[PDB]
Design a protein around this ligand. Sequence first.
Ligand SMILES: O=c1ccn([C@@H]2O[C@H](COP(=O)(O)OP(=O)(O)O)[C@@H](O)[C@H]2O)c(=O)[nH]1
Length: 351
Amino acid sequence: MKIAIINMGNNVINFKTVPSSETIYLFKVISEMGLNVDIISLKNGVYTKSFDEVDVNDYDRLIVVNSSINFFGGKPNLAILSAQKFMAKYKSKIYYLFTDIRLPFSQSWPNVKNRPWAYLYTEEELLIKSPIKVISQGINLDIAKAAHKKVDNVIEFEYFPIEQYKIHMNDFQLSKPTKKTLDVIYGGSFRSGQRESKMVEFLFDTGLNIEFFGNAREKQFKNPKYPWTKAPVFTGKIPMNMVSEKNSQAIAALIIGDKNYNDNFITLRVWETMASDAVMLIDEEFDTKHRIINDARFYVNNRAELIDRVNELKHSDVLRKEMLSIQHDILNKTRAKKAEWQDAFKKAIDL
DNA sequence: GATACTAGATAG
DNA sequence: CTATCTGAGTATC
Ligand SMILES: O=c1ccn([C@@H]2O[C@H](COP(=O)(O)OP(=O)(O)O)[C@@H](O)[C@H]2O)c(=O)[nH]1
C-alpha cells in the first residue's frame, strides 16, 4: 500500500504558506497512522518528491488537497498545471480533501483552452477522467454537492473532520500560560471578502487592543456595506506550526466562519484557539447549538458582547483561568478519540 | 532577463 | 448571488 498526497494548486515546501503547511501536516498525520505516503510537488525536497520523477500509477491511493484554479496575472500557474497533469494520468479513484468551501474541484482545461498560451497544453494532458470522491470537512453534504454541481466525475461525497489533524499529531501539546499583550487576536487571510461583515463586526471599531495577523491587509476592507473607522493592528503572516503560540499572546481569540461554515464546518482555528492560552470566543451564529463547548460564556452574539466578555476576562483572572481549563479539557476529550478518528480516515480513503 | 507567493471585478 | 471574464502588487532561502 503506497499513498500519494498532493496539493492541487500550491507549491509544497515548508510551513511558510498555509497551503503547503496543511499538505505537510496531512502527510505527517497519515504517516503516523502507519501508512506509506509521499507528498508529490513541483520539486524534490525535504518533504517532497517531484511530479516528474515518480509514476502516479505506482500509488494505490491519490489524495488531493483542494485548491482554486487561478492563473495570476493571466500567466500560467505551474502548481495547478503540473498537479492536474499528474492527476490526469492516474487510473484510479481520486480522493479530494474539501477543507475550504471556496475550493471545490474543477477542471483546468476549460480555463486553459481559452488562454493565449493554450498551445502549451492539450486536453489529453489536463483533462481528469478518474472518478472523484469528495471528503467534505463540512458535515452538510448537500452544500458540498452543490459546490461541485458543475463537475460530473465526482461520484462520492463523505463527511470527515479533516481539521482535527492538528490535535492528533503525535507531538501535540497545549500552550502554557503566556504574557498577555493583546485583548483579542485573529489570524487568517481576507478570504476574498467572504467573511468581511463578521471581521468588521468583531475586530474593527471595538476600542480594544486587537491584532489581526496573517495575509489580510487593511486596504482590502472597502465594502461600503460594512463601514469602519478604526481597524485592528494588522501584522504579517507566521508559519502555521506557530499559530497556537501566536494566539496565546491575547486574552481571547475570535472564532468566526463563512456563512456556509455555520453549524457545518469545524475549522483549524477552533482547535488552534482551543489549544492556545487565549480564551476561545465563538460567534453564536457559527455554532448555534454550542456543540463545540457546552458553556454559553464562550459565545458572543455581536461586537458589544465581545467587548463585555473580554473586559470580564481581563477583570477576573479566576474566570479567565477557569475558562482556559475548560476549553483545554474539552480538547483533550476529543484527543482521547484519536484511534476512532484514524480509523474513520482510513475508511474514508477506502483502507 | 528573478523568483515566490496570493483572486478581484464585472455580467446576468 | 452565481456564472463568467480579466489578469498584478507585495515579499524575498
Ligand atoms: O499568519 C497566519 C494566519 C493564519 N494561518 C493559518 O490559516 C488558518 C486560517 O485560514 P483562513 O484564513 O482560510 O480562515 P478559516 O476559513 O480557516 O477560518 C489558520 O487557522 C491557520 O492555520 C497561518 O498559518 N498563519
